[PDB]
Amino acid sequence: RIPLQIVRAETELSAEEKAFLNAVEKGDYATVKQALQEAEIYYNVNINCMDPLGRSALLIAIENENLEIMELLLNHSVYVGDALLYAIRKEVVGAVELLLSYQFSEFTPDITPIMLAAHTNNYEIIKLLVQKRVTIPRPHQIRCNCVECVSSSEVDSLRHSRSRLNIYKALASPSLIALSSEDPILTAFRLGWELKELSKVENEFKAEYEELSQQCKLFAKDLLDQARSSRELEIILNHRDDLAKLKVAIKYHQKEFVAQPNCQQLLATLWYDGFPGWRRKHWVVKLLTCMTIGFLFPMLSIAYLISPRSNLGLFIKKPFIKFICHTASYLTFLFMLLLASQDLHVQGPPPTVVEWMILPWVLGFIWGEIKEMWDGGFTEYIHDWWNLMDFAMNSLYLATISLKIVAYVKYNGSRPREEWEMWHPTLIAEALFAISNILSSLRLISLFTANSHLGPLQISLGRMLLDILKFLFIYCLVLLAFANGLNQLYFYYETRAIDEPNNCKGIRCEKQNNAFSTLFETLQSLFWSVFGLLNLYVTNVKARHEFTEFVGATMFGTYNVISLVVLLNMLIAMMNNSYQLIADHADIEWKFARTKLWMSYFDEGGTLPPPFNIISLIQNQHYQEVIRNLVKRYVAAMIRNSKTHEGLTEENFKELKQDISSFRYEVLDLL
Amino acid sequence: TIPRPHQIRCNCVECVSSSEVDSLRHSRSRLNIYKALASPSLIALSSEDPILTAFRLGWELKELSKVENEFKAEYEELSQQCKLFAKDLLDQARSSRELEIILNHRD
Amino acid sequence: RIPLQIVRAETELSAEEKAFLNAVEKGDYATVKQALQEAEIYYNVNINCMDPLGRSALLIAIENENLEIMELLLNHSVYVGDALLYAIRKEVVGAVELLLSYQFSEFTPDITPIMLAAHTNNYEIIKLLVQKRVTIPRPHQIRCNCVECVSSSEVDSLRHSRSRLNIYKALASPSLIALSSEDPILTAFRLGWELKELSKVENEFKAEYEELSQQCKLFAKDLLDQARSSRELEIILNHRDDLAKLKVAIKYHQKEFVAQPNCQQLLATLWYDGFPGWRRKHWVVKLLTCMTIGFLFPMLSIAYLISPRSNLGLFIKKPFIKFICHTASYLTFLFMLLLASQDLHVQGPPPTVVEWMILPWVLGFIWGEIKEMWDGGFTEYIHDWWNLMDFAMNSLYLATISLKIVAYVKYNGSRPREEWEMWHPTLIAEALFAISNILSSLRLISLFTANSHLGPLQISLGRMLLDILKFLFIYCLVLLAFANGLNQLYFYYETRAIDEPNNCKGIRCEKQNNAFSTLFETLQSLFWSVFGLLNLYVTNVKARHEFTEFVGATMFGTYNVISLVVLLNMLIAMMNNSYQLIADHADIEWKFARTKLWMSYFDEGGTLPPPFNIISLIQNQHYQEVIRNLVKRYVAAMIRNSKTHEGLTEENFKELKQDISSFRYEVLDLL
């Protein structure tokens, strides 16, 4: 048998005292008042005493919203401490007003009434608390190293982190940003960015800072949603302290704000500037118009170069026409690169007619990249992540040009390629040119963003490449390990190239040999084993060492089982799990990326596609009025949605029970 | 009375003027009209043929969903609501004659 | 502008008449009674009139559960029709009792009060209706062809199907089976089986019959769940009209009833008969005991053959020991089959020592199969779906024996196999023996059911083989189509075997040839193209018909794209979708299959593993008492669970509003 007792004993209540608390619970005003006036005389019943479940009489009256017993206890001067916070968390405006008019606690000591109101996100109570001059202390920097922060971290790191988290949850309140903020949209933007940075820094408290940042982004989105006219939309988007607030939203990565339908509609009607009725057109006439503009890019470009002030000169300044001209010029560049592959023994030859055409687009690409560098700056250049491969293309083109010039100057004769040197400058130049050709032709992935049916697909690829990168570390570790083992076994039986039937050594021969003789060749062989191009007899030696053969063969088999059966199917399962997490927000992310692509063409800089590129208090007052109407509409909408969602608990049933019982004792008293 | 929405691809002076002056209010007004018209109760009353009315309204809402790219989901859900209303109206039949009168009616 | 009107006009109410219905809605008894006694004199207010929303005064009083206005209207003799059914659907026992004591309708004409009560599944109302002698008409046979059924199908097939569905939904009520049934468990079993058959037949009304069958199975499971002692469990399982009811449940495929924890515990303690403490033992001692019993199967078998009445004779009659002995004998048979592969030029040789051992297990397997046939019967034999491959094994073994005997009798000499005939009886016999070896060795999949970690895996394979079978039709259609096309192109360039370098024709040669010359070889080639074993140069001819080559090559490429890229990934996606639908019920299905495997060993027949197999109203009364206690417990439990689930709608809020308003007019009248 197990004895049961109370190992942590407390102070029990007496019979009359339990009767008093029970009368408070059922709401008998006559009995409670009689007990109070009897206690004032006899000092028998403690009015500030506790209950078995953690509450006192004022707490019971507050949770049961019985304002009349609550004010009776206030008039009898019961203990008051933390009951204000209890009324704040209870969301009872009458209790809040009465306690403003005048041990164990389930609240942290930092909990201030404004902060608990900001947690409860109740606009009424937050505004009544803000009516009095009440202050929230400022959080320090994200990476602050001052003496106060290091002392608070050293003394009690749990209370420091809880205090910072408590401050930021107070500040991220949608009601507390709707009031007491000169610019709620910009405040929500900066607060969301800061909460994202604190989510990145504080690893353990990551999810709560993530959800606070998401709450701020949702608040900004709904505030934009409450607009009701195109002027108000453009006052919001064009406020600066054009499209300044939109550029700020793009800078702070507010994809929910950017992907608003009204903002996307305004961006679309700015994008289709020259064509007012592109929204309602057929597929065939859209394709015909696109090809018609795309076949006239040199005419429009030379029109801009000659006279910007004409029906054709400023026609390319429209964003869609500029995008079509850039795409058409780049596609003609790729067509010429395809034509370039269509005497070959000259050492360091002069450039042909096709390369003589290619050279100005190469110079224009380099000039455009360095012009974007010099104009935008550094962080904006490195943030794009396409400029890395753009730099790779420019570097490979420059290397090809330099090697071609070096070969043309240094060599003159016509020697057949069969006896050329292996590190010949012409060979190096042509290899670099082919690599740059591939990089140029995969640069077209960036144009899938502007299409409706390919943009989310590109977003899904960009989100699953991260998991491919995660898997590549494990696969390369396994590859290095098995390459090391197979080298350590097989590098005694290395054979010269002369002993081979056709003077070829390596896995690229007709008869594959020496697949595990050197570390480079072992890495190549175990890489090509994934696609099945490495035959089985590469695990063979001329000597009769059958045990050596069997250990090498089972090493190869273990590598194949780990890679193709385990790791590849692991990669399939990982990307399949990752795709479902992206399919929900793919539309929003695609709309954000397409907005960035659209705003990339709104500038006057970079207008000419290559190779042609080498040849004020009223605004504040109107914005304040629009935001004031927006805040009123948003508070009304979130009040309506609070009165439309579920919201109901057993609090409501015990509230109705309390009202019925208080009335019951009232009419039993009056009758 | 509810004012009539114009054509899906209408190019008249009133529509182009309303699109140019305030495109948000124009789109909100058209969306508001179509949400009013797609009401199952408002098709159950005031309609000479609720089944055919729901059919044509669902097709039109599908076309406006195809055209209006930004307001796609709401027109999709209105078309789905009209299709569900037609399905439930057919579901409420209680005899094979009524089923065949519904299926064999021609106008 | 669109005009709005009422195209289907109805009869509006007058002002006093709307006032009367509004007074009924708010529950003013004084106003309603005054209006009734004024209408009795003046005949100005119609008491049976309709409202704008389809109801009359009695309907409003019934839906608002206001029994006093309802009985007032009953005393004033308002229209009564279908208000009883309205009270049945409303689940108000007072309204039901009062209407029992005494146009447009949303109910079908077949709706009878007992049937609507059975739909509502309210035990109280169903019992009060059953107190009066009330009858439900019998549904006919599933495939009945009588004149009444064919006439009802021809006249109005919608009303006939709705009537049958209405009858079966009435009969499948858990309360209506808990009452008025001599055997609720057997009634639920037969009703679930019948509803499954009607689900199979009625294709359009499939889901509702499926959910009714599932409801009956759940009712039987919960009725078994309400047992509270091992005697009651065994009275339920051992009732017959041992384990007769359990065998009936297995026959009717009640997997939920079979997979009950108490039933599985009783089956386990019958299964581990000889070992009382196998439940609490270590893995190593379990493995040691299993190998110890498995190495002694001939000793236990010969002990049973010599003397069944001993410590070793009846030791094999225990189910676990019998299962271990069968498994050990069959594993030794497979070990001998492995040994059989370890002079070869004799035409029709005598059987060797290994085959002379194999022959009695072959005879024992055939004898056991025909004995199971003769004992169990026909449907039980063909239902197992393992007996098909068992028959295949027996037929191949018999064919091997017959061909070996024919070869031994007909041939005597010793000719080397290089010049044997291609259809030689020895060659045919050895091919059939190898095929039977594979079938014998994959017969071990059936033993994965008895294991804890492999049984659900076998269930998942058995459920995804259906989708593989579904996909195989499409793949074989594509295979036949592309084989036909490639034959029609390539059968002009068929070459003889002599013209080949090594006198070999077909895709099984060193140099693959003639892959699309005949239909059989084209089917083989396009089958082997799936696994990559068919090289690319099989699409080549000796002549210089390059267009012919290109069309053949692009046909091969189109087939590879359809098969490996589209169809194989389709199969992967289909099985991945199918696995998630099986992972939920895999435990229940595995427990059912393991119960079937356990009951297969409970019989005295088939005790000896091969080759050794060729060498009474008190029961009804106790069952009735146990079922009566079970029904009382189940009704109490489902009443408690009805008072524990959500169950609450705006009906409850308008009920409380009606009570408050009726009281309000009452006290305004009394004061």
Ligand SMILES: CC(C)CCC[C@@H](C)[C@H]1CC[C@H]2[C@@H]3CC=C4C[C@@H](OC(=O)CCC(=O)O)CC[C@]4(C)[C@H]3CC[C@]12C
């Ligand atoms: C991949 C196969 C078919 C070979 C063809 C290669 C290229 C000639 C293709 C592949 C990707 C194509 C691009 C994919 C997407 C677009 C966006 C498209 O713009 C839209 O979606 C129209 C609406 C809008 O811009 O608002 C204009 C054509 C373009 C650049 C396409 C131009 C032609 C490209 C470069």
Ligand SMILES: CC(C)CCC[C@@H](C)[C@H]1CC[C@H]2[C@@H]3CC=C4C[C@@H](OC(=O)CCC(=O)O)CC[C@]4(C)[C@H]3CC[C@]12C
């Ligand atoms: C597959 C590899 C490891 C080669 C070995 C082949 C056979 C020797 C294996 C494969 C499947 C095995 C069987 C899989 C499952 C079981 C059930 C197992 O029983 C239990 O799970 C114990 C608990 C119980 O029976 O209640 C007894 C051994 C047995 C027949 C195994 C016996 C050994 C088998 C035939």
Ligand SMILES: [Ca+2]
């Ligand atoms: Ca760039």
Ligand SMILES: [Ca+2]
């Ligand atoms: Ca059998």
Ligand SMILES: [Zn+2]
């Ligand atoms: Zn600091």
Ligand SMILES: [Zn+2]
């Ligand atoms: Zn118009």
Ligand SMILES: [Zn+2]
């Ligand atoms: Zn009949």
